[PDB]
Structures are given as C-alpha cells and as structure tokens.
C-alpha cells in the first residue's frame, strides 16, 4: 500500500487488505511540545472508534508510561501499562507495529518496546487512527 504522507492529526486511514500476519505498519512523526500530554495510535474497525483492537497510548505523565488497551462496543477493557517512556516531547520518532499470529510486536526507533497479545481477531481491523499530541510525517505499510 502507498504511504500516507503528512496527514493532519487527528488522522484516520484505511489499512488496505486489513491487518495480516507479518504486516508491518510504521508511524513516523514528532511528539509535540505545547499541545498536551498524550497521544494514541489505534488499530480499529471502520470509523466508529468504538471498536479498537489495539489502542497504543503514550502518556507524558507521572514520569512517563504507555497504556495498551482494547475497546469493544465503546467500552475500554482493563489496561496494560508499561512504566517506561521511549518517546520524548519535541523529538521525532519511528514507531513500528508488526502483526504476529498471537500478538502485536511494537518497536520504537528500532528497539522492541512492548508486545500486545491479541484480545480480538486482528483480521477484523481495517483502519489506523492517530490523535493527540503528535504531528505525522508518514504512515507506511
């Protein structure tokens, strides 16, 4: 699939073919300095953000941590929290999501950061959405 170049945030874009085992999705952008304390990348079903298979949610709060969660029919599940922050306000990042049979493997600037075990079927995902305190250079596949 051709990349999305400099899309405005908040952004929502189709993942052509849906999520597939071995698919790699890169989000390349910059964390904003004066526009809040959180962003998220959502792997979701269509345009209701009510069904989000994987919400990846860095928070520049409390020393910095990342929330990983799933939303179903509007309701957020129990969070998994990673109490390390690999991003920095005002710095560019390369964020890579690799779909695997049982989990997502998430890399930041080339280094494995977290794995998120599938809670819902990943083949149901057809949309990536990004919002909060970031600007995007590209999303690629």
Ligand X SMILES: CC(=O)N[C@H]1[C@@H](O[C@H]2[C@@H](O)[C@@H](CO)O[C@@H](O[C@@H]3[C@@H](O)[C@H](O)O[C@H](CO)[C@@H]3O)[C@@H]2NC(C)=O)O[C@H](CO)[C@H](O)[C@@H]1O
38 near ligand X, rule: CB under 6 A: yes
122 phi, psi to nearest 5 deg: -70, -20
Q: How far is the CB of 50 from ligand X (least distance, A)?
A: 10
- Which range, of 22-30, 37-45, 82-90, 101-109, touches ligand X by CB under 6 A? 37-45
61 is in an annotated binding site: no
82 near ligand X, rule: CB under 6 A: no
Give the C-alpha separation, 31 to 108, whole Å.
13
7 is in an annotated binding site: no
Single residue of 40, 114, 134, 136 touching ligand X by CB under 6 A:
40
109 is in an annotated binding site: no
Single residue of 55, 95, 99, 113 touching ligand X by CB under 6 A:
55
107-139 burial: b if 16+ Cβ within 10 Å, else e = bbeeeebbebebebebeebbbbbbbbbbbbbeb
- Closest to 19 measured CA to CA, from 74, 95, 101: 101
47 near ligand X, rule: CB under 6 A: no
Within a 10 A sphere around the Cβ of 31, how many other Cβ atoms?
Answer: 19
Binding site for ligand X (CB under 6 A): 38-40, 55, 57, 67, 69, 76, 79, 131-132
């Amino acid at each position: 699939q051709a990349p999305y170049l400099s899309p405005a945030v908040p952004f929502s874009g189709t993942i052509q073919g849906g999520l597939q085992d071995g698919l790699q999705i890169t989000v390349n952008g910059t964390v904003l300095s004066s526009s809040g304390t959180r962003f998220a990348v959502n792997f979701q079903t269509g345009f209701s953000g009510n069904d989000i298979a994987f919400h990846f949610n860095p928070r520049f709060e409390d020393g910095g941590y990342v929330v990983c969660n799933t939303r179903q029919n509007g309701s957020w599940g129990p969070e998994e929290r990673k109490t390390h922050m690999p991003f920095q306000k005002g710095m560019p990042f390369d964020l890579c999501f690799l779909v695997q049979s049982s989990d997502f493997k998430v890399m930041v600037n080339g280094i494995l950061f977290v794995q998120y075990f599938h809670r819902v079927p990943f083949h149901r995902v057809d949309t990536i959405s990004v919002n909060g305190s970031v600007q995007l250079s590209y999303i690629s596949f």
